[PDB]
């Protein structure tokens, strides 16, 4: 209810104080992270990273009623979402499904249990390569900005961890390349 309410139960969450205040500036937002915080278990302990990602679904949910939002927030607690990316699609799925909304139909549609690995990643970007070879071979080095967007929007890489797509890109571009030269002088 009252700011004093809400600022007690979002620092004993952890939430810093500097974070609180801005917190409880929207109104809305704060009373939707009040509700969703009551909807986990009593003894369950908050750290940077869930107290971020429910901010990040109260945020989304802005004041509004959820039918169905202990889904996403279950997720989150347990680790199951452990984006923003996925807190975003469990939103957009729970909020579509309204009161149909199961655990096992938003974990299938938010990217639950996807683990691309390393070797996914590579494999995504050696197929890329291949398909765009002779645009890459003509342009070199200066198209690696250009690979890297084409790569972060593959559909097969939504869920991928983003900061694997550049040191695999160099150095697949390096095998068909081979080193800067002073073709690639800028």
Request: charged letters at 30%; proline letters at 3%; a neutral charge.
């Amino acid at each position: 209810s009252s700011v004093e309410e809400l600022t007690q139960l979002f620092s004993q969450v952890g939430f810093e104080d500097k974070k609180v205040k801005e917190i409880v500036k929207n109104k809305k937002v704060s009373d939707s992270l009040y509700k969703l915080i009551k909807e986990t278990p009593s003894d369950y302990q908050w750290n940077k990273s869930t107290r971020a990602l429910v901010h990040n679904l109260a945020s989304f949910v802005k004041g509004t009623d959820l039918p169905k939002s202990e889904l996403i927030v279950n997720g989150i607690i347990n680790g199951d979402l452990k984006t923003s990316l996925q807190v975003d699609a469990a939103f957009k799925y729970v909020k579509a499904n309204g009161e149909a909304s199961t655990k096992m139909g938003m974990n299938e549609n938010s990217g639950v249990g996807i683990e691309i690995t390393e070797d996914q990643v590579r494999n995504y970007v050696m197929q890329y390569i291949q398909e765009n070879k002779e645009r890459i071979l003509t342009e070199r080095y200066k198209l690696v900005p250009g690979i890297f967007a084409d790569v972060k929007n593959l559909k097969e890489l939504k869920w991928a961890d983003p900061r694997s797509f550049k040191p695999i890109i160099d150095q697949e571009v390096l095998k068909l390349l081979g080193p800067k030269d002073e073709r690639d002088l800028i």
